[PDB]
A paper describes a structure:
Here we report that the 2-aminoisobutyric acid hydroxylase from Rhodococcus wratislaviensis, AibH1H2, requires manganese to functionalize a strong, aliphatic C–H bond (BDE = 100 kcal/mol). Structural and spectroscopic studies of this enzyme reveal a redox-active, heterobimetallic manganese–iron active site at the locus of O2 activation and substrate coordination. Metabolism of 2-aminoisobutyric acid (AIB) in Rhodococcus wratislaviensis proceeds via the initial, selective hydroxylation of the pro-(R) methyl group by the monooxygenase AibH1H2 to furnish α-methyl-d-serine (d-MeSer). Previously, recombinant expression of AibH1H2 in Escherichia coli enabled its structural characterization and revealed distinct mono- and dinuclear metal binding sites housed within the AibH1 and AibH2 protein subunits, respectively.
The expression of AibH1H2 in rich medium (lysogeny broth) furnished samples (LBAibH1H2) that contained ∼1.7 equiv of Fe and ∼1 equiv of Mn per AibH1H2 heterodimer (entry 2). The incorporation of tightly bound manganese ions was evident upon inspection of the electron paramagnetic resonance (EPR) spectra of exhaustively dialyzed samples. Unlike the case for FeAibH1H2, enzymatic assays employing LBAibH1H2 yielded substantial quantities of d-MeSer (33 equiv/AibH1H2). Since the protein structures of these two samples were found to be identical (RMSD = 0.34 Å over all atoms), our findings suggested an apparent requirement for one or more Mn ions in AibH1H2. For example, while our most active preparations have Mn in Site 0, other preparations, specifically LBAibH1H2, possess only 1 Mn ion and ∼2 Fe ions but are still competent for turnover. Although the precise location of the metals was not determined for this protein preparation, our biochemical data suggest that either (a) one of the Fe ions must occupy Site 0 or (b) there is a mixture of metalated and mismetalated protein if Mn must occupy Site 0 and Site 2. If the former is true, it would suggest that the metal identity of Site 0 is not specific and AibH1 may accept the most abundant metal available in the cellular environment.
Author numbering:
A (entry chain F): 12 to 374
B (entry chain E), C (entry chain A): 29 to 378
D (entry chain B): 11 to 373
The structure:
C-alpha cells in the first residue's frame, strides 16, 4: 500500500467510524463473542450499557450524518461522499471510539484487559480491511490497551508496520499519568515502529473526571475534558519521558488547544523556582513542545476577540496544530468556516497541511 | 482612599503544640498523648525553593513566617503595603476524624486571632473551616462572623466533593450571610488523586497542575447555580495563577450556549459571571509580568477588575511582588491591581 | 401471627421509557431527545448466570421480573410466602446530574407504586432515594412515608461518602421519622474504585468482594454515632452474604475497647449494637445452607434474631431459598428466619 | 556467610518492626536522595509533609514499655535482642522495615517519586542485613521493593534477594491495582526465580481511599478497615489466575487478621459455582488455591466471644497456612504465651508457631 501523500488536499486528524452491528466478530475469538453475549463489556462504571456521562442531545451526533441504517460513521460510502470527497481530505486519520452496538466505550478500557486487547485487535483488522484498504485516503490510528503494556506492545508489533497505520491511539484518561514508567514499553514500541501517538478525549481511566470530584452538569462534564489533557501534558513533559524517547511524537485529540499555552507558560514559570526537584529533566519544560507535543483543533477555540485565537495558537506552538473535523460528532468543524475571518492564511494553510504531514511523517 | 491590600500572605504554625492554649481539655490532652503529630502540609515543602525567601526573617529553627513579628517586619518594611490578608495553610482539612478537624480548625483561628490579628491592626485573615463537614464548616464561619478582622473564608483548591454540590451550599450560604468572600487557595484534601488521571509524582507537577481543579471548581460553582442562589458571592482565587482563565471562560461560554436548558437558572454568560464574581491574586504571575503580557491577559480576561495584588509572602516565586508593573504600560491598571479591585472584597481604606 | 416475608425480591425496569408517565414533560422530552440512555446497572449482568434461574418466567426479551404478574406468579406459586419486599436496582443513583437523579428516582418509585404495589396487595417495596443529594433523599423518603406499602429505604452498598458521614445524616433522620428501616443492597455508585486497592477486573470478583464495603458502612454508621443520634434505626443488609459478620464484629469490638475516648458516645459494645440493629437476608446463603452450618453461623453471630428469609427472586444462587433448612436441625430457628425476625422490620401479620 | 535459618525449639515470628536510628540509612543513600529528602521529605499519597493520612493515636501506637533511652521503639538493637528475641525464644524473626525514620507506618515503597523509593528500599536492605541480620541471624529480612515500579522491584530482587540473610520480599496491602493484575507479575516472576515467598503487610496509601466506598473518620473505622484491603487482595490474587501462572508462588498476608478470610473464601466458592463461566481460564476451584499459595500471620489475634470459634475458623481457612507473629513493638503486640484461647488445640498452635512458617519460608 502506498505511503500517504498530501498535495492540494488537507489533513483531518480525528474521524470516528463505527463498526456495523456484528462487523467485528470475524476477528474475535469465540471466547469473547460468548463473553460479550453473557457479560457485555464491563468497564469503570456500574452501568451495563452506557458510560457514566451518556451523550446529551441525540447521542452528540450531527443530525445529517445518520445513514439509512445504523449509527453515524457506520456507512463507508456516506463517509467518502460527505466527508472525504466533500472536503478533499487526502489524509483522514480514523480513531475508532467504540465497537458499537453494545457499547460506546473505548475498547482499551474494558476492565477485563484480555477482552480489551481482543476488541482492539478486532477493531484494527476491521478498520484496516473495511476502510483503509478500500479507500486509502483513510489511515488508522490503532487503538491499544495502554493499561496492559504487554498487550499494547504485542499489537503495535503485529499491525504497527502496516502502511495503512499512521499512529497509535490511547485515551486522555488513564490510571496513572502518561509520563509514568508504566507506559514506556508502549512508547518504545511506537518509536521502534516509527509511529506517533494520539490521545483522544475519553471518560473512564479509574479516577473521577476532575482532580477534585465527579461533575454534575453537562457543561462541567464537557468543559472538564481539557483538564485531563492538561494533566497528561505536564506528566509527559516533566517525567523526562521525552528525554528517554527523544523521537516520540504525541498529539492531544479533541482537548482544545489555547489552554495549553498558559499551561506551558505556568509550567515554565514554576519550574524556574522548583527545577531542583527534577534535576534530570534535560530541558526547560516548554522546550519539549515543538519536537514532541501536537494538538488537534476541534472543537475550535472561540475567543471573544477573534484575533486571540491566532495569538494563543502561536504561543502553544504554531507548527504543532493540526486540523481535525471530528466527523460526524455534533460540534463538527468545517475547514472553510472554523477559523475566524482575520486568521493569518499562512498559519491556516499549515494547520491544514504542513503540520499534519510532519506529525504523521508525510514528506 | 482604598488601601493597598496584600491579598495573600501566610502564617506558618510552629507545631501542633501552638494550638494547646486554644484547645479544650479533651483535645489538648489527646493531642499530647498522640505525641502531637503535625499536619504540616506539603503544598510548600519546607526545604524547597518555594517555601521562603533567602532573606526572609526567620526564627530559632530558620523557618519564616512562624511569628507575626517576623512576618510584619518583612511585609511592611518598605511602607508600600497597608494591609495583609493572612492565610494559615496548616492542614486541619486533612484531619479525617471530623470532630478533631472541627476542634483544630477553631483552635487555629484562635491562634490567628490571639497571636496575629491582636499583634498588628494591619493584619486581616481568612477563616480556616472544617470542610469535611459543611454544616460544621458553616458553623465555623458563623463563629467568626463577628470579628471583622476575619475578612474571608479559606477553602482548599482540591476538596472532597466539588464546591457547587448541594452538600457544600452551607459553606456558600454562611459566607454570603457573613458578607465574607470565599477564597480557594492552592492545596487539597487529597481524598482522590489530584488529577483526573492519577497521582502527580513530583510536587512540581502537582503545583502546576492544580489550575485544572480550579476550572472544575468554578464550573461546578456556576453550573450548579451558586451565583443565583447566593448572588452576593465573591470568590478569590489565591495563589492559583489566572492566565489559564480566558481559554476556560471561552469554552465554558461556548458549551453553555449548547447546554443552557440543562442549567436554565444560568441566564448570564459564564464569561460575564466570572468577570463579576471571580477575583485572583497576582503572586505567582506565571509570566504576565513579562513585557506587555499583563496588558494581554487583561484583554483576554475582558476585565481589569479581576486581578488583586498579593506577594504570597513568604513564598519565593520566579518574579517578585511588583514585577507585575513590567507587564503593563497603564498606571490605572496598576491602581486597580494595587488597591481598587480588592476594595470589592474587603472595603478597607487608608 | 407474624407473616412469612420474602425480604428481598427484585423488580427490573424494562427500559427508561417505562418512566415517562411519571416524569414531568421537561424530563420526559429530555429523555426521548437523549435517545433514552438506560441506567440499567451491571450488578447482575442480564445475560449472566445470576440474572435469573431457568425456572423464572421471562418477557419478550428473555428477561425476568420486568412485570409484577410474572414475579407474583413465580414468588407465590407454592403458597409458602405471605409478603415480598420488592427492590428495584435501576441505576438512578449513577445519574450524575443531580436534578435528573431526583426526578428519575421520583418516577421510579411512582412506577413501583402504580405498576407493582397497586397490582398485588401482597407486595411491599423500598423507597429509592437520590443519594447524591442527601437532603433530596430525606425529602423523598418523606414524600412516600404516607404510603405504608413502602416499608424501607434503599441505599446501595457502595456510596459516594460513607453512610455515617454527617453529610448523610439527613437520610437516617428521614427514615427514622418515617418508621422505616434502611436497607443496604449489593450495588454501588462507583464514584471510586469499589475496593481499597483499585478496580476488580471481573463481575465475579466485584460481587464476592462487596462484603468488604458493608464492613466499612457498618463501622461508619456505628462509630459516627448514627445509633445514638437516631436510636430507632434498623439496618437490613440485603443480598450481601452474612457469614463475614462475626469476624468483623469481634474485631470492631476489641478495637472499640482500645479506642473508647475516640468515640465517647458509643457506650455499648458494637457486638450488642449490631445484634440489635442489623438484620441480614439469607439469599445468597454463601455455604451456611450446609449441614450444621446455619446453626454454626448463628452461634457465631451470637444472636438468632438477625437472619431474615429472602429468595432474592429472580436471581440464581448456588443454593435455593429453602435450602437453608439443610443447615439447621432447629425448627425454632427456621421460624425466626421465616417470620419472627422480619416482624421487627415490617410488622406484617398474615 | 550465614547458616540457613533453623527452627527447632524456638518459634517463628513473621512480623518484627525495626526502625533505623536517625542517619542510620545515610551511609547507604546517594547524596542526591539525602538532599531530596531534606527539601521535599518523602512525598506520597497525602498532602502532608511528615505524617500519613491516619497518624496513630495513643503513644504513637507503640508499646509503652518498648521505648529505648533515646530513639524510637525498634531502633535499639540491644533492646530488640533482650525484649523480643531473647524473651520469647524466637529462632526466625522476619524483619519488616516500614519506615526510614522514627515513625510507625511510612513505607519507602510508597514514595510518589519512585526513584527515591527504590533508593530508600535499596538502603533499607543494605542496612538491615548489615546492622541486624548478620550480627544476629535469628533475624532475617523481608526486603521492601517498589511494587508500583516493577522494573525497579525486579532489579532489587536480583541484587540482594539471593542473600542467605533474606527470606521474603516485602509489599503493602494497598496498591494502585489489585495484586492479581499483570502489572505485578514481573515481580512474582523474579521472586520465584530467587526462591522467595512474598509478604504483604498492612499499609495505608496505595492510591485509593482506605475503603472501597470512602475514607474512614474514626480510628475504629481505620484500624478495623485494614481487614478490607486483604479481602480485596486475596480475591484478586486467587481469581486472576496468578497462581496458574506461578504454581510455586507463596504469598503471606501480614497483619490483616485471619478468621475473616474463611467466610470470605466460603463466599467466593459459593458465588463461583454460579458465576464461574466469567473466569473460564481458572484451572482450580478458587478455595483449592489457598493451601498452596495463601498464608496469613496471626497478629492481632482474633478474639471471638466464644473462644472455640477461633480454632474452628482458622481450620476453615487452612490450618496449615497460619503463621505466628508478635508485631513487636506495636501496641497490640501479641505475646505467644497468652495470645491463644484456652480451649485451643496444641497441634494447631505449634504448627502456627513452627511448621507453617517453616514451610512458607522453606526452612
Ligand atoms: Fe473526536
Ligand atoms: Fe467528539
Ligand atoms: Fe499563598
Ligand atoms: Fe437482592
Ligand atoms: Fe506489623
Ligand atoms: Fe502494627
Ligand atoms: Mg478452562
Amino acid at each position: 500500500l502506498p505511503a500517504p501523500s498530501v498535495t492540494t488536499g488537507i489533513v483531518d486528524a480525528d474521524i470516528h467510524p463505527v463498526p456495523q452491528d456484528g462487523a467485528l466478530e470475524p476477528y474475535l475469538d469465540d471466547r469473547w463473542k460468548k463473553h460479550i453475549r453473557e457479560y457485555g463489556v464491563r468497564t469503570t462504571t456500574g452501568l451495563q450499557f452506557i458510560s457514566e456521562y451518556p451523550q446529551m442531545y441525540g447521542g452528540a451526533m450531527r443530525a445529517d450524518a445518520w445513514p439509512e441504517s445504523g449509527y453515524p460513521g457506520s456507512d463507508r460510502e456516506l463517509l467518502r461522499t460527505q466527508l472525504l470527497d466533500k472536503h478533499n481530505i487526502q489524509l483522514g486519520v480514523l480513531q475508532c471510539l467504540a465497537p458499537g452496538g453494545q457499547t460506546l466505550n473505548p475498547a482499551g478500557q474494558a476492565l477485563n484487559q484480555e477482552l480489551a486487547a481482543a476488541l482492539c485487535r478486532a477493531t484494527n483488522d476491521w478498520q484496516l480491511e473495511h476502510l483503509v484498504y478500500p479507500d486509502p485516503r483513510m489511515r488508522a490510528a490503532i487503538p491499544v490497551t495502554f493499561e496492559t503494556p504487554d498487550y499494547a506492545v504485542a499489537e503495535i508489533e503485529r499491525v504497527g508496520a502496516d502502511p495503512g497505520v499512521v499512529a497509535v491511539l490511547g485515551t486522555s484518561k488513564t490510571l496513572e499519568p502518561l509520563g509514568s514508567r508504566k507506559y514506556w514499553p508502549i512508547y518504545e514500541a511506537s518509536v521502534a515502529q516509527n509511529l506517533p501517538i494520539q490521545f483522544h478525549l475519553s471518560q473512564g481511566g479509574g479516577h473521577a473526571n476532575t482532580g477534585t470530584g465527579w461533575t454534575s452538569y453537562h457543561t462541567e462534564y464537557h468543559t472538564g475534558h481539557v483538564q485531563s489533557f492538561q494533566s497528561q501534558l505536564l506528566s509527559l513533559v516533566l517525567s523526562g519521558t521525552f528525554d528517554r524517547f527523544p523521537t516520540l511524537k504525541v498529539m492531544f485529540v479533541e482537548g482544545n488547544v489555547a489552554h495549553f499555552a498558559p499551561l506551558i507558560q505556568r509550567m515554565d514559570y514554576t519550574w524556574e523556582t522548583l527545577r531542583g526537584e527534577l534535576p534530570d529533566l534535560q530541558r526547560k519544560p516548554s522546550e519539549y513542545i515543538r519536537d514532541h507535543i501536537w494538538a488537534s483543533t476541534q472543537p475550535i477555540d472561540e475567543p471573544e476577540k477573534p484575533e486571540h485565537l491566532a495569538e494563543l495558537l502561536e504561543e502553544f506552538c504554531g507548527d504543532n496544530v493540526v486540523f481535525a473535523t471530528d466527523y460526524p460528532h455534533f460540534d463538527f468543524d468545517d475547514p472553510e468556516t472554523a477559523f475566524p475571518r482575520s486568521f493569518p492564511v499562512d498559519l491556516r494553510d499549515k494547520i491544514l497541511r504542513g503540520n499534519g504531514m510532519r506529525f504523521f511523517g508525510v514528506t | 482612599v482604598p488601601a493597598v491590600v496584600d491579598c495573600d500572605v501566610h502564617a506558618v504554625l510552629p507545631s501542633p503544640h501552638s494550638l494547646i492554649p486554644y484547645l479544650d481539655e479533651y483535645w489538648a490532652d489527646q493531642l499530647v498523648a498522640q505525641l502531637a503529630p503535625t499536619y504540616e502540609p506539603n503544598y510548600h515543602p519546607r526545604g524547597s525553593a518555594i517555601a521562603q525567601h533567602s532573606d526572609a526573617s526567620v526564627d530559632e529553627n530558620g523557618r519564616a513566617a512562624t511569628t507575626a513579628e517576623n512576618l510584619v517586619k518583612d511585609v511592611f518594611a518598605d511602607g508600600f503595603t497597608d494591609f495583609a490578608v493572612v492565610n494559615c495553610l496548616y492542614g486541619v482539612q486533612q484531619i479525617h476524624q471530623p470532630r478533631r478537624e472541627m476542634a483544630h480548625a477553631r483552635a487555629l483561628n484562635h491562634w490567628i486571632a490571639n497571636e496575629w490579628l491582636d499583634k498588628d491592626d494591619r493584619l486581616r485573615a481568612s477563616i480556616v473551616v472544617p470542610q469535611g463537614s459543611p454544616r460544621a464548616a458553616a458553623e465555623e464561619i458563623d463563629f467568626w462572623s463577628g470579628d471583622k478582622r476575619f475578612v474571608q473564608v479559606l477553602l482548599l483548591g482540591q476538596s472532597e466533593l466539588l464546591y457547587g454540590r448541594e452538600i457544600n451550599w452551607p459553606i456558600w450560604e454562611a459566607a454570603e450571610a457573613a458578607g465574607l468572600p470565599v477564597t480557594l487557595h492552592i492545596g487539597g484534601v487529597f481524598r482522590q488523586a489530584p488529577t483526573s488521571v492519577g497521582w502527580p509524582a513530583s510536587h512540581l507537577e502537582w503545583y502546576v497542575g492544580q489550575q485544572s481543579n480550579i476550572e472544575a471548581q468554578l464550573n461546578s460553582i456556576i453550573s450548579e447555580g451558586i451565583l443565583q442562589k447566593f448572588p452576593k458571592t465573591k470568590i478569590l482565587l489565591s495563589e492559583l495563577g489566572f492566565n489559564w482563565l480566558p481559554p476556560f471562560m471561552w469554552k465554558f461560554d461556548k458549551l453553555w450556549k449548547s447546554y443552557r436548558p440543562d442549567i436554565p437558572w444560568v441566564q448570564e454568560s459564564p464569561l460575564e459571571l466570572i468577570r463579576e464574581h471571580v477575583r485572583v491574586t497576582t503572586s505567582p504571575s506565571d509570566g504576565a509580568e513579562e513585557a506587555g503580557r499583563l496588558d494581554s491577559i487583561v484583554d483576554r480576561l475582558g476585565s481589569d477588575r479581576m486581578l488583586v495584588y498579593s506577594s504570597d509572602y513568604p513564598h519565593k516565586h520566579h518574579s517578585g511582588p511588583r514585577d507585575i508593573e513590567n507587564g503593563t504600560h497603564s498606571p490605572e491598571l496598576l491602581d486597580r491591581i494595587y488597591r481598587r479591585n480588592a476594595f470589592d472584597l474587603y472595603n478597607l481604606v487608608v
